């Protein structure tokens, strides 16, 4: 129950950092989405895809 707490804490902190740092990085195509677009071009959807795909890469030894 400590391990899931570590999983949910890292997932909460990852989704919180992708919410915070969406306007920080200038993307290479010049994306600049808004705070509530939730579309596939934006930083937040790709970054929450990164915080969705970290645990499955760790068990199955994917980079």
- Cβ-in-10-Å burial (0-12, 13-18, 19+) of 49 comes to exposed
Buried b (16+ CB within 10 A) or exposed e, 10-31: eeeebeeebeeebeeeeeeeee
Q: What is the DSSP string of 13-25?
A: HHHHHHHHTTTTS
* Data resolution in angstroms: 4.1
- Residues sharing a CB contact under 8 Å with residue 21, sequence separation 6 or more, in sequence order: 43, 47
- Alpha-carbon 2 to chain mean position: 23
Q: Which method was used?
A: cryo-EM
Cβ–Cβ under 8 Å, residues 53 and 20:
no
CA dist 10 and 1 (Å) reads 14
């Amino acid at each position: 129950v400590d391990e899931r707490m570590v999983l949910e804490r890292v997932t909460r902190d990852c989704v919180q950092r992708c919410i915070v740092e969406e306007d920080l990085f200038l993307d290479e195509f010049g994306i600049q989405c808004e705070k509530a677009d939730n579309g596939e071009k934006c930083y937040k959807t790709r970054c929450t895809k990164g915080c969705a795909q970290w645990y499955r890469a760790l068990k199955e030894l994917e980079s």
